[PDB]
Each structure stands twice: as C-alpha cells, then as structure tokens.
C-alpha cells in the first residue's frame, strides 16, 4: 500500500507536508491532493520535491478533518482524513 504521515506548520504561512512511509515508491506521475477546509476551490494539488509533497497556502479553513488523497492521473489511489491542528511538528 501507499500510506503516508503528514505534518503541518502554523503558529499564526500555513504549510502542510507529506512524506511517503513506503520505502521504495516510484513517486512518479502520482500527486497528492488536499480537499475540504479550503476557501475558493474544493480541492488543491500539492507540489513535489525529492520525495516529499508540500502545500503552502493561507487559504486553509483549519476546521474539521481534511481529506488528503493520492491521484495517478484522474483516478484516486488512496485517501485519509486528518485534522490539521493535530499534525504539528515540534
């Protein structure tokens, strides 16, 4: 499977990072997506770097559990629903 463990930074720009937990993923053509608790659009796409996906946008509502999914093209690969206020790095 393609599980992952995200962590967010926000003490007052709203940042959210997600790193794959599986050891050797191809990590090509697949992209992360964040839905729910957004302003203008219902879903927004991450940005890849090395093997970590990064989304930095102050348009977060910070309410409820937001849905982080992985898509390969237009089909979803896996999904999870996490509260962004609990995933905070030290």
């Amino acid at each position, epitope marked *: 499977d393609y599980s992952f463990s995200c962590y967010s930074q926000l003490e007052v720009q709203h940042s959210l990072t997600c790193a794959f937990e599986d050891p050797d993923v191809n990590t090509t053509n697949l992209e992360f*997506e964040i*839905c*729910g608790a957004l302003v203008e659009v*219902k*879903c927004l796409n991450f940005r890849k770097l090395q093997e970590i996906y990064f989304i930095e946008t102050k348009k977060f509502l910070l309410i409820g559990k937001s*849905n982080i999914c992985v*898509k390969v093209g237009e*089909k*979803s690969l896996t999904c*999870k629903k996490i509260d962004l206020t609990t995933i905070v790095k030290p």
Partner: antibody
Amino acid sequence: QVQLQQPGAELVMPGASVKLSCKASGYTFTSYWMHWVKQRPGEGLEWIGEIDPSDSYTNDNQKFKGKATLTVDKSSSTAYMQLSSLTSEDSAVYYCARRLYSNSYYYAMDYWGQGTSVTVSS
Amino acid sequence: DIQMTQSPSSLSASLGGKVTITCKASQDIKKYIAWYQHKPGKGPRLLIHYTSTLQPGIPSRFSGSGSGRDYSFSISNLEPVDIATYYCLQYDNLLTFGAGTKLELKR
C-alpha cells in the same frame, strides 16, 4: 449498468428506530460516495447527508442531527441510514444515490435509487 | 441553505419545441450546479452537471448555461419521453434543490 436497490416501502410505528438499506452493484464500493435525499409527498428534494465508504466519514445536514446516522458495511457493499425517534413528520420517500467520482466534500450525484416510501403511523 | 429559486413552477410547450428553466442562487455557487430529471414513480436521473457538461447517454438536445448566481437549462426538439419534473442542485457548500418544473406536452 449501476444498480442501487432499496426496499420499496416500510411501515414502522413512531417512537422506534429503523435502518434503511441501499445495496450497490456494478462498481467498486470504496471508490464512490453515497448521498441520501428525503422527499415529502408534495414537497421537493432535501439532502440529508453523505457518507464516505473508505473510512465512514460523514458530512450531514444539520437539520437531521440525531435523527439520521449514515453507516456503511463494506463487505456486503451496502450503505445504511438509521432513523431514530420516528414521528409523523418523518413519513417521506428516502432515495439513495451514488456520488460522482471526486475527493471533494460537497458534490452532486448521477445515478439514483428507487426510494423507500416510509409511512409512519400507529 | 443557499436558496435556489427555480422558475417557472410549471410550463408546457408543443411537440418538437424548446423549453427553458432558470435557477437563481442566493449567493455565488461558482458554477457548481446540476439539473435532474424526475419521472413519476422512478428515481431521478442526472442530465447536466457543472452548468453545461452533459452525461454519457444524454442526448445533445439538453443544453445548459449560466454564471455565478443565474443559470439556465433548455430542452430542444421536445419528444414525448420528456414528460417529467426538473430540479436544480447547488454543491458549493450544501445541496439545495429547486422548486421543480412540471413539463407538459401540448397535444
């Protein structure tokens, strides 16, 4: 070829709690969401809530708080709506519909069910 | 919550004609509107999603348009198989349906 089957009608006296079923066939069950709609005899359509079969996440209308509780059995590929404390104002037709393919929360549906004509009377 | 005022409540046109139904939202729903056909007894059937994008199997005689708060839907070359009701639906923050439009064939 997407089938959504529900019982045509059920009669249960007020004050009890029933569980309407919605059995889906023709698609992967953990890939599409399910919505429920209440329709009074003369009134139109009223969305009740939506359930995600992947992990039983609910986005429900606040008008039906404590009344409707959307659950899901993944092995049988079935979605349930539990209505508690039935009254005469709950006697309506309850449709279940498959949501379009999306990860967003509020999204429309395409294929519907036949609806359960629930009648509440002692 | 978002009031979806539909108009008219009931209309009628001739065989092979064209009918038009409008829906006005109480706020900007950002082109998130769909139109549903509802025959008596049987369940609803989606015709057009996202203002004007059709569904597989829906003929090209069902058109739609609109912006922000005002949207319109049209049926051309009326066939006798289109005698039903038609509902709107917004999906920007909630799921509010319109009042419906009873279509009638003028024979």
